[PDB]
Amino acid sequence: ERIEQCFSRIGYEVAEGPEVEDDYHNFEALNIPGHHPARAMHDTFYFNANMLLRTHTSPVQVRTMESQQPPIRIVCPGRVYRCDSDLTHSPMFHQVEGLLVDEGVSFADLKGTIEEFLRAFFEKQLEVRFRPSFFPFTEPSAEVDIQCVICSGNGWLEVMGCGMVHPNVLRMSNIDPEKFQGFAFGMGAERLAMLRYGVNDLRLFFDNDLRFLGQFR
Amino acid sequence: ERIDVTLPGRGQLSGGLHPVTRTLERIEQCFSRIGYEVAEGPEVEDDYHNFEALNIPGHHPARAMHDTFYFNANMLLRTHTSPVQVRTMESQQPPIRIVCPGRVYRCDSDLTHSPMFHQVEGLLVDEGVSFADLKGTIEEFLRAFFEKQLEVRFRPSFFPFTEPSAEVDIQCGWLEVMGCGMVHPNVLRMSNIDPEKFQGFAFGMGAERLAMLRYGVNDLRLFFDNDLRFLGQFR
Amino acid sequence: RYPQARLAPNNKPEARAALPLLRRLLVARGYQEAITFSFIDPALFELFDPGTQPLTLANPISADMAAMRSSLWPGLVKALQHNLNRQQSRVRLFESGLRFVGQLEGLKQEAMLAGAICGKRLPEGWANGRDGVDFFDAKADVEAVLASAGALGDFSFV
Amino acid sequence: MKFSEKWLRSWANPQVSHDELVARLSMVGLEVDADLPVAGAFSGVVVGEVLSTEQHPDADKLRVCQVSNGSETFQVVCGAPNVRAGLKIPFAMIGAELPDDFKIKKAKLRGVESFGMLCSAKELQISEENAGLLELPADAPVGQDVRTYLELADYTIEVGLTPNRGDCLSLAGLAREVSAIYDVPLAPVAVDAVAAQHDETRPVELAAPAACPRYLGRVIRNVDLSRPTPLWMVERLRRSDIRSIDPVVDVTNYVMIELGQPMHAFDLAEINGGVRVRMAEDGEKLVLLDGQEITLRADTLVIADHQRALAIAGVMGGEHSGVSDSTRDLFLEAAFFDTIALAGKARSYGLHTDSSHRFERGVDSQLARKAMERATRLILDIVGGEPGPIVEQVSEAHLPKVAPITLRAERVTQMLGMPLDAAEIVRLLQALELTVVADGEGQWSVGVPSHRFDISLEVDLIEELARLYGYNRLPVRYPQARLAPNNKPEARAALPLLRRLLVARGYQEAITFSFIDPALFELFDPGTQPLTLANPISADMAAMRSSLWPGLVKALQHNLNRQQSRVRLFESGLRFVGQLEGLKQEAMLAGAICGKRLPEGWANGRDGVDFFDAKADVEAVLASAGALGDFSFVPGEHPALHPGQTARIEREGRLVGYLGALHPELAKKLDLEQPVFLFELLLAEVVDGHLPKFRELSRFPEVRRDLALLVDQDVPAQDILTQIRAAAGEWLTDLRLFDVYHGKGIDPHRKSLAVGLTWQHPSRTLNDDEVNSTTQNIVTSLEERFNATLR
Numbered sequence A: 001e002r003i004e005q006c007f008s009r010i011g012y013e014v015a016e017g018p019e020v021e022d023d024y025h026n027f028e029a030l031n032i033p034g035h036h037p038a039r040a041m042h043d044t045f046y047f048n049a050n051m052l053l054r055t056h057t058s059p060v061q062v063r064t065m066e067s068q069q070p071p072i073r074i075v076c077p078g079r080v081y082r083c084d085s086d087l088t089h090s091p092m093f094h095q096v097e098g099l100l101v102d103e104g105v106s107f108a109d110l111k112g113t114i115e116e117f118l119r120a121f122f123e124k125q126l127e128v129r130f131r132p133s134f135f136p137f138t139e140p141s142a143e144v145d146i147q148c149v150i151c152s153g154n155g156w157l158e159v160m161g162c163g164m165v166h167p168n169v170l171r172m173s174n175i176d177p178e179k180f181q182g183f184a185f186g187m188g189a190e191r192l193a194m195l196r197y198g199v200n201d202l203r204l205f206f207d208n209d210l211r212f213l214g215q216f217r
Numbered sequence B: 001e002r003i004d005v006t007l008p009g010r011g012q013l014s015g016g017l018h019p020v021t022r023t024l025e026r027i028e029q030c031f032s033r034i035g036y037e038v039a040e041g042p043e044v045e046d047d048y049h050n051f052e053a054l055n056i057p058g059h060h061p062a063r064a065m066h067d068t069f070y071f072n073a074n075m076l077l078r079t080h081t082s083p084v085q086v087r088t089m090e091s092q093q094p095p096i097r098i099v100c101p102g103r104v105y106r107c108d109s110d111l112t113h114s115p116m117f118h119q120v121e122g123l124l125v126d127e128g129v130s131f132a133d134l135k136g137t138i139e140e141f142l143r144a145f146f147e148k149q150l151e152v153r154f155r156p157s158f159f160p161f162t163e164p165s166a167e168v169d170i171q172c173g174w175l176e177v178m179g180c181g182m183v184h185p186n187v188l189r190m191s192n193i194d195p196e197k198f199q200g201f202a203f204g205m206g207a208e209r210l211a212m213l214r215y216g217v218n219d220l221r222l223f224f225d226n227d228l229r230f231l232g233q234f235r
Numbered sequence C: 001r002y003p004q005a006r007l008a009p010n011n012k013p014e015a016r017a018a019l020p021l022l023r024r025l026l027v028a029r030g031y032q033e034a035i036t037f038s039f040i041d042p043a044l045f046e047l048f049d050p051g052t053q054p055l056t057l058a059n060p061i062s063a064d065m066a067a068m069r070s071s072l073w074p075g076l077v078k079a080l081q082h083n084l085n086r087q088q089s090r091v092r093l094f095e096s097g098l099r100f101v102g103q104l105e106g107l108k109q110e111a112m113l114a115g116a117i118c119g120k121r122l123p124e125g126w127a128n129g130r131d132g133v134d135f136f137d138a139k140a141d142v143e144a145v146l147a148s149a150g151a152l153g154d155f156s157f158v
Numbered sequence D: 001m002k003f004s005e006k007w008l009r010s011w012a013n014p015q016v017s018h019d020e021l022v023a024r025l026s027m028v029g030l031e032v033d034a035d036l037p038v039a040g041a042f043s044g045v046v047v048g049e050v051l052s053t054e055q056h057p058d059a060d061k062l063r064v065c066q067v068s069n070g071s072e073t074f075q076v077v078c079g080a081p082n083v084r085a086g087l088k089i090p091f092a093m094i095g096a097e098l099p100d101d102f103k104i105k106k107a108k109l110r111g112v113e114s115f116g117m118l119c120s121a122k123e124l125q126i127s128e129e130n131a132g133l134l135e136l137p138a139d140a141p142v143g144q145d146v147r148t149y150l151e152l153a154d155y156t157i158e159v160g161l162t163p164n165r166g167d168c169l170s171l172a173g174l175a176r177e178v179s180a181i182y183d184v185p186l187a188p189v190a191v192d193a194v195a196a197q198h199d200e201t202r203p204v205e206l207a208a209p210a211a212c213p214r215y216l217g218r219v220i221r222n223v224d225l226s227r228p229t230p231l232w233m234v235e236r237l238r239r240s241d242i243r244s245i246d247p248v249v250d251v252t253n254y255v256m257i258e259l260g261q262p263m264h265a266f267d268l269a270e271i272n273g274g275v276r277v278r279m280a281e282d283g284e285k286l287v288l289l290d291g292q293e294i295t296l297r298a299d300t301l302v303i304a305d306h307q308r309a310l311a312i313a314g315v316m317g318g319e320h321s322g323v324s325d326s327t328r329d330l331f332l333e334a335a336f337f338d339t340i341a342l343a344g345k346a347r348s349y350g351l352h353t354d355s356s357h358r359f360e361r362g363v364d365s366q367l368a369r370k371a372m373e374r375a376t377r378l379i380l381d382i383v384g385g386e387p388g389p390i391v392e393q394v395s396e397a398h399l400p401k402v403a404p405i406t407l408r409a410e411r412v413t414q415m416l417g418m419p420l421d422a423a424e425i426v427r428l429l430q431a432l433e434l435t436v437v438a439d440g441e442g443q444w445s446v447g448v449p450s451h452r453f454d455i456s457l458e459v460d461l462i463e464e465l466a467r468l469y470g471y472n473r474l475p476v477r478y479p480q481a482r483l484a485p486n487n488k489p490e491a492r493a494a495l496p497l498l499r500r501l502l503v504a505r506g507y508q509e510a511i512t513f514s515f516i517d518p519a520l521f522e523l524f525d526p527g528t529q530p531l532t533l534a535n536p537i538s539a540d541m542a543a544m545r546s547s548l549w550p551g552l553v554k555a556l557q558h559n560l561n562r563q564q565s566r567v568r569l570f571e572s573g574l575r576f577v578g579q580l581e582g583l584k585q586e587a588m589l590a591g592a593i594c595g596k597r598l599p600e601g602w603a604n605g606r607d608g609v610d611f612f613d614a615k616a617d618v619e620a621v622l623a624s625a626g627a628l629g630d631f632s633f634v635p636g637e638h639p640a641l642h643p644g645q646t647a648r649i650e651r652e653g654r655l656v657g658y659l660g661a662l663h664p665e666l667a668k669k670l671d672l673e674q675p676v677f678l679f680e681l682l683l684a685e686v687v688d689g690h691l692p693k694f695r696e697l698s699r700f701p702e703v704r705r706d707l708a709l710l711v712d713q714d715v716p717a718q719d720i721l722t723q724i725r726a727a728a729g730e731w732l733t734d735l736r737l738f739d740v741y742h743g744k745g746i747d748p749h750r751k752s753l754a755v756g757l758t759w760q761h762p763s764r765t766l767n768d769d770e771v772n773s774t775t776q777n778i779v780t781s782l783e784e785r786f787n788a789t790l791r
């Protein structure tokens, strides 16, 4: 709710999609080639050759790009699934993904957006760090760090990723990369909730013990 | 064999909100979703904030005891939520994007007019604001509010606080629903905003008028009687 | 045209009980929302606020609309009995608004949330007990409001 | 990718401290995962030489040694089983400070004087080898500090590389980055061509030039494979997490880790008629050096001879073709394999190697020759032998070629939110070994170097610029937007709204796994085939739920077993209905309740929850958008629910969902002793409501009449209430069922329904005659439709 509110107050629309997705929307449309290790059964849950449980909410942003032409300002919260799980990682979890596609969007715009979102979210004027990273769907890309001012138990923490939308991602969904620029971002809800509420064990989220739940009234 | 029927459920069920409250929430939401901040101020106001700051001269008929409720020579019950927009202009420098819902008071009442009512006023002050910007804002607000792609008409009017100004009509052969205009240079100047660098637009609307249009309410007096037979209809 | 804006993500703090939130809670808890005139009869004002001089209007619309309220209670009670006289048994109303406390020099204009209840604890129904409302029913309503932002423990009923 | 900083700095030295380097690395996109010292701290330890050993005359486990530090001979008593004359060893002199505050003092061990100590790698925190003394190379410099000699003032930096930086899978790659980052000279290893000593070659055929456009081969005659890998190489490999196995593999590994070129050595005797670089035949069998027997596919590139396949190209060598003890001659290989052609191939056979990784990520297409010469020199140095000429088979047509990219200054300024100077741009791009030629005002034609596989577009160039400039040094702006006022329709019950209503109504929000146990699924949905996962995490997480109920019930009993009496939970989420072809993924709002109706309290009745408590909860939700009237609760049936206490919920005849008590048989099966009340609503059928349409308020009094109605015990109350409304006329304002009686005062198969009927006329007072008239018509209608009677 809180993550959505930070963006909906500024013109972002909440977008939803199906949890059972196809390889085009989940991978191909996002510049993830057929031979890419993310597609493997070691990470992705499959029904058949083409149908899977979504690994991210990125397919929702794809379905939006296909349905409409820019401007696009969306936030995509939802349940996502990953095969490679145990402790520290669950087979099901929640994440919010963002997308902004307009005529003159920059990496400066992206930095401003992310920095202010985190400040708004954690209710502090905290330091925000952008480290270069990689994603098939974004270029340039960054891993976003914040100081440990929200602890590792109530000097930097990685909290989310972002980047400028890849030209091929737009091109594939009929958006001209010469006319339109865009930025996208992703974050895990459980990771954020753990930082915010001082939750140590991620497994408490799916047990539904009243002794856990009651503490968030 | 422990069968039962489908009788009503046990206990308390929900009540509801007042139709004006529903209407104010809705008006605020149209703007808060695009960056407007909700601003509030006092209902007992001074001459300066309520009139002078809004380019309403001392001899202006709006100031008279025939229209304005007074406590003494300078203290009154606000005739509009415009003083809230003034207090905002004094407190900060542009950009300003605010909506000001609230209780307002008018002396000249009977039927068609109540001594107390609600209105939402808007203000946007930035570097390159135009009358085209204002038209776009108002037309899109009304379509959003009435959930229809209705025709919007702008008629030239007058206000001491705005120039140029317009009375805004919508179909159903037309109905006047609100007013607006470009902020007067003297209004900005008085609140330390340079009219050469900053332009702005403001708008005003009555909540009861809007609620009446929306819900089909005939008599405006139903709003302050609080009859449960009235209230219950908005659950 | 539509005006351009360099907008930044933002939000109010998480742990706060806003008035739109509280209103909806009182709706779920079986309350109807009333809006009463800010100026009341001086005699009514005196009944609820003995000894205090109201902030009185110089040109009131009528003499029974001359006093600025120091409580939403006279107005709520009046709307309650308006209904009672109109064949209503169970009247559960709430109002939010400003109170006017003091004379011009030192006047406090504070936002209040007030509620008033009467009649049976529950609506008339086959499955419902015919007990009349009491203190502890209103208490639960206040408790629910006071706990809306996880700070119930901070409050005490003395 | 792990490496020795000392070795890196021998190529490009940043001239900053260790901490500064490790910090910058992550800031430029090479995230450091670890930075560790190569050893423990100690002083006063030098290279010593054992001149003689003698048996200690008063302790058999000890030896009396004469050891030189290159300046003086000291008598050291040693008990290590490997201490012998000629041995080069770490000599800890008197005064030496060893790890964990161990100061070497003078000693008289069993009547014999000892002026120092000889050490094991363990004693010095070098390795965990305490078996004996750390035996140093025969040619070690006697007297030199052991930390200097063994390069112990060092750290191993480990970088978590991104798939686009395959070029950084070597010291050559990493040192190039540092040179760019810090604008410092890059001093690569000078690799002199090794001259052929003879003319023996082996022919090489490129049967698949699109998959291997360059292949290099070299004959190395009369190698002594008994010889050991030198310490400097073992240490360099080790500091990169490569364990020493054999001299020949160690050098091919070393060349790979040093330069980035994976190389392979074959036993020349195992090559029949020269090399053929070709695709495998479908079902061609090859045994790998690790013993794995792979059944190959036609899409896989192999290194073969004229008889059979020898290796799976760029991934792993075969057992037969590889070096053994009997090997006297080698055939060295350094080739370039196309990345596209090799992608996922190792994985498809369940394999992953340092070679497969580098080739898939990209290996400099021009590198093979420098690598060949380097490995030749190392092989001759380590195991001797005689080199023949290099056989280079190349396909100019299939060599990788990236067209030059035009970079526009305006595009960099636009993206970065600030302009960069032309000199800065050129400096930075040229540092990364890109070819930058000016192409008019604020434009350049830039060429991509052979080692870089991630650069083909103008944005990739801007990325490089941003990266080396510093992401955190770039400006911060908020995006511009032409925003218009907007809103969703007023008359709608959204899920955030409903959640808060449920909260206020005493519910706790649960979130359960979307995939459940097929057996649980079968309990709640008997004849339905679930949408089952092909690769489930476990078999009890194989079925996609068609109801939120199994998960909610399970969370409810989880709590019951945890000393909870009153469990009131709700969940919202997707329902999966049908097989892929026709699959419906619908958002549902479901709830489950048990225990006392109210929490334990002085003022609260101790009654347990029942159907009608859950009913009120559904009613409250269904009324959230002023459309309660649109819904009807009809007596229905559901397999998971009690058939005597189940309501089918409808809107315009369409199914909204179900409300009921969990079936007693399902409870038995789940070992649930308490009654449970469930509801589940299709959110699509709940969200739409109706906007208030004002109806004028009468100025006149209302009139009420109470009716006590005797009806058959099984006739539904809503059927009677509907008949009453239909027969009450136009002025009925309210109808209330205030009591139901199924007692002794009447027949055991009948019930009394006490109803309150209110009427109000909008324009006048109602008279008793007309109201009694209307009342009698209601009664008459109920007598004819239900054979009803007044009490």
Ligand SMILES: Cc1ccc(OCc2nc(C(=O)N[C@H]3CCS(=O)(=O)C3)cs2)cc1
Binding pocket: A030, A058, A059, A061, A062, A095, A097, A098, A099, A135, A137, A138, A159, A160, A161, A162, A163, A165, A169, A184, A185, A186, A187, A188, A189
């Ligand atoms: C069309 C389109 C284009 C781009 C998109 O990019 C979504 C993105 N996600 C990230 C990211 O770092 N995600 C992970 C962070 C932590 S997590 O919860 O594991 C998710 C960066 S950019 C999506 C859709």
Ligand SMILES: Cc1ccc(OCc2nc(C(=O)N[C@H]3CCS(=O)(=O)C3)cs2)cc1
Binding pocket: B054, B082, B083, B085, B086, B119, B121, B122, B123, B159, B161, B162, B177, B178, B179, B180, B181, B183, B184, B187, B202, B203, B204, B205, B206, B207
């Ligand atoms: C500083 C500042 C500057 C300008 C402002 O202009 C407020 C405005 N009001 C109107 C208007 O038409 N108002 C009436 C409509 C119906 S009503 O309820 O009678 C109120 C138009 S522009 C306000 C504040």
